[PDB]
Symmetry: C4
């Protein structure tokens, strides 16, 4: 049976810890994939952590140079949420240096992008086998979400980008049923930049909060209807949530336009709450350290700076990284609404640390009816490792 996912996102007062994998600490001795870009997505029966391996293990010579993003060895794999990305519990998914994945109620669909930068191929898998593909349409690192795609009533949606990472690119919405592409649209967004969308279902639509890697320190927003018409813009709130970013005091905000005039960025997320927004961000304005989430009153629909809740999940003495959105299936939560959850990637190694390698672990949080106290569920691994000596 297909997951409906037509419900509204639950309104939440805070986020409770779901899981923590401790992958890099475990990987000091155990047999753990060197990874990055982990993310969580759920079937009616379980949630899983997906991750992009470097085709190599922590504390091994082959983990050298893994700060690098793309290689013929990178693969999309998965384990149960909270499990480390160890070899012996991992399910192979796809050959990928960029990925998205989601379940439609019947089977898992995964999308793994691999191949040369100038002519990359995205392979769509459904039920454990290749069923369709997408070739690069702009010849410049075809790529996608690095978090859960979104299935509503049996059709699954995701966002892809092809083109420059620092100027105007091209962006598309794809739609599949049972692993077969049944629709696609170009996203018109001149002056804007869309990368690494974090999406979720809400009121029968797909809402996405993404990454502007061009000029914006506020995040692009994309609301997708099943017919593939869309509304695109920026998260209205007068609070910048990208990294690097400027100070809140010096930021104005816009529903339509990038602001902040800074390059680069980091994958991040947001949840709509009626007209409010939960927005995640690193504590540091310049570095990928710390992680907090703010509820901005009316932040979804106007340039509001009215912060009504704030919760810290990783302190600023510790490394963070990417973050992304997913929802709990009604079949698992037992709710009449979609429980909003997020994950935080905690990057260790290069370029910040004294190692030959780069990897990451994850902490997972889910929205609840209560305020949750500030804490830090940081990575906690002790660097350098043996292989670095």
């Amino acid at each position: 049976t297909y997951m409906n996912n037509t419900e509204a996102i639950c309104d939440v007062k805070g986020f409770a810890p779901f899981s923590k994998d401790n992958g890099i600490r475990i990987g000091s001795r155990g047999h753990i994939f060197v990874i990055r870009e982990p993310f969580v997505s759920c079937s009616p029966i379980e949630c899983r952590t997906f991750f992009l391996t470097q085709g190599s293990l922590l504390n091994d010579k082959h983990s050298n140079g893994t700060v690098k993003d793309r290689s013929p060895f990178r693969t999309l794999m998965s384990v149960k949420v909270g499990q480390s990305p160890n070899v012996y519990q991992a399910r192979f998914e796809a050959v990928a240096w960029s990925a998205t994945a989601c379940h439609d109620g019947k089977k898992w669909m995964t999308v793994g992008v691999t191949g040369p930068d100038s002519k990359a191929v995205a392979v769509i898998h459904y039920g454990g086998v290749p069923t369709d593909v997408i070739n690069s349409w702009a010849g410049d690192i075809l790529r996608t979400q690095e978090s859960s795609c979104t299935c509503i009533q049996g059709d699954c949606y995701w966002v892809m980008t092809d083109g420059p990472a620092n100027r105007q690119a091209q962006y598309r919405i794809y739609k599949a049923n049972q692993g077969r592409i049944i629709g696609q649209a170009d996203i018109s967004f001149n002056g804007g930049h869309i990368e690494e969308c974090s999406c979720y279902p809400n009121d029968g639509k797909v809402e996405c909060v993404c990454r502007d890697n061009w000029t914006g320190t506020n995040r692009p927003v994309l609301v997708i209807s099943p017919d593939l018409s869309y509304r695109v813009g920026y998260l209205c709130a007068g609070i910048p949530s990208d990294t690097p970013r400027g100070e809140d005091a010096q930021f104005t905000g816009s529903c339509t336009s990038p602001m902040g005039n800074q390059g680069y960025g980091v994958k991040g997320f947001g949840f709509r709450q009626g007209t409010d927004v939960w927005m995640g961000r690193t504590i540091s304005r310049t570095s990928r350290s710390g992680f907090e989430i703010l509820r901005i009153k009316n932040g979804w629909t106007q340039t509001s700076k009215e912060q009504v809740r704030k919760q810290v999940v990783v302190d600023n003495l510790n490394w963070s990284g990417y973050s992304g959105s997913f929802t709990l299936p009604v079949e698992l939560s037992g709710k009449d609404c979609l429980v909003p959850c997020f994950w935080v990637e905690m990057i260790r190694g290069k370029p910040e640390e004294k190692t030959i390698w780069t990897s990451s672990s994850s902490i997972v949080m889910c929205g609840v009816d209560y305020e949750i106290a500030d804490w830090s569920w940081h990575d906690g691994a002790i660097l350098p490792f043996d292989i670095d000596k």
Copy 2:
């Protein structure tokens, strides 16, 4: 289908060995979580060992300082009973430095407590996802059983404490159905202290034998009715079963009050047998070494010193630690009564031994219709380990 668990506890003459995981011996070479606080609980299909990891492995540098109780890295995980807490067979449960877990016949409910000491959060999971929470109500290390909680006809019960570990604290009973809290009560117990309850079903009620960490060397007793009224007191028997404790000769006993005038303690258990009691305890009066279980005639209902059976499972030349109660589902035993079983934690490392780490393994015993001979199924690991050199 919900497990009824309305039957009486089986009357038993002795305890047969169920399992032994050999985790620390195996962990000399294999990939085994550094743990403590293990415990067993059963679904209609299998029994599992739950444990609190230190988010690190035996014989690794990250096992340093693991004598410590609370950290952001500790997680509740589980394997099949008798299996070591190895990485590759473990199921993630919750983020936790204190935990309880039980099955209701349909799904597993787990409760993991993490967060800061002053404002800890307990997260209730059901079927593998967060479904509810409990915030600290007294701001002082919210905490719970460290053994199986108890499900009767679909509702699950457990005991939590919030407050000082060495003076008057606050104690509560919680009740859930399908991962959702449907009831709670404050336990009135001025002059008494309740920690780390070991519970089990008996005649449609939840019986608990707990730990007084304040003044008592006898164990608090809590009998919970489904409506959440309760009777609370001390295990009547004129035999002290906490550690540290005084000599039996110098102990009087009380059904209502703590006795012994000593601080500290250790998690322990007891089974009612009509009006008798099976009470477990360390052989040593001062240290966590050895383990024996005594059947005291009329020990549940009066200050009796009449020991009618005694069985040793770990000798006094060897380290023990915590111990806890669980029952075999009727669906597994095939009995018309609930088979009483217990587990013994065997702690190795600090503070007693010459290592940088603390962990433990477990032996599991189940009540039978026969007397069982004394023996010692001790941990058997050879310390120090390589990482200590």
Copy 3:
């Protein structure tokens, strides 16, 4: 549904290789239990290798002194047939330094013997939990088959011994249904000695070929009826199949009495074939090296020396050890008869080799309609290991 196992044993011309685990070779680097006494038994869905661990791993310091037979750390565990006894694929069964196990069509029954030599306890498990026990009845190392027990129409049978290993002991047949003992008998056998029976179903009865560790170099035979009456004696054939043994030329044979006047022995097996017998044995008369199986015409019912088939599975340049019998379920083979299969234990280390440890691997063979060529599927590990240096 219960397995009937009322059919006749298939008549076979030879034995084809089923499996080989390579446990000790793999254990040079992988995480493998130090074991001995492995054996195979089958459910309607799969065959599994059971084994007695030493609660320690190959190439680890804790594998020291594992030539020893009994300890509090030994456990019965299992994996799929052909898999090594690695940690990460193993299912815990029982605490045991002696064991038997078999499936009744619905669930696995296992019997693990542990405890002190003078008062050992056998624990019967069914469906993964303790359901019954047997206490030592003669106070001298209660012990059992070390191979598959035998289930016919839902009732399971096995043979146990209690008493001296080198003089007259006591021997019993046990019968269980669903993990509960429903019958037992003393085996009258003055002058004879029964150890480590290898049994199988045949024509609605349990046939066993065992080990005389007292005076006999021929093997005791036990035919058990469901009502627990029995016939007991020695395998008639004028060929001795125990180890150590004398030369064939100097052996007479007897259906009723031990012959050969030598102490010690080794677990071995035999299959009835009408009135013929397949008998396994080490090639060496004195040492546990090599393995061959002979079909002796009329060897089951008379002192025949007429060898009609001979097949070698391990050459005499290589170490062997125990061997045992099991049958393929009709539900798996698709036959109208019970396929006879055997396993051979290949012991490495002490006392023959230059190591601190003793372990073993296994090769598994199943009867077919064809002659199979001689070969040697020996252990192949290269000793000493690192831990021995």
Copy 4:
């Protein structure tokens, strides 16, 4: 339910990456079987990688001399496609130094060949147990496909060879139902040589492209009908696809006869496409380096040199090796045709490299409706390994 597999092979424009196991890179630290001869085959539920172990692990002393082809330690095992051949995820299949395997819709059938060169035994397993055998009929290394066998409507077909590897041998087709041999035929092919067939279903027949290890640099072709009549010859195309081979310019081609006058070879594959052919081959004419696949117009039915598509999957700076064919079940793809897929073995170590060992990893590709860009998904391991120093 039996898989029909009566459909036509899908016509494909290119091949998308399915999987990559990274076994040898992972094996630098993890616990990975030393293997060779991997291959993929699919049930209605999943595809699996089968492989022949050396009964030893990467980076262990026992991996020494593994350039060798046949030993008593080699076993057929399997994991999920894309997973490394690690110990802890592997399912035992058969004792084998040559193998084939396929699923009939109900259960897996495997065929493992082991024993002495002069009298080898092939054991057929079905549903996890031995059900039948084939003894050497020509006394000279009985052997088979090293890729998926082929099941059509419940009957499974494969090709075996017995005899010289460099002159006229003997070749047979076998047919089984539910693990039982129900038919066989001798293949008449004087002047020709058939090894290591790569087969697949097409229009209710079994098509095979094989290896001539005698004189031919073009590949033998075998089309098998269910009644076991056959047509045998050579892949017509005027392009040689064996290794070693001569230049394309100097090759003529033949539907009936070997051409090229060179010894040796390598396992390879081909897919019929109407009258066209997809033929795989190493880029190098002399060495097992690189891998490309050519679509030759009318290449199946005439000596055509008309190359209409070309796709590279491993560049000529990198080691390749064997390659083989399989199809996606309709039950998995959702197609009305059989999706053609292939795997490429990437051999590392001896004789080309500076190690004591030989192993390999694999990349898997499946036919799609699109052209796929050239790339190289090479092994990527860094040699020598620690054990080589």
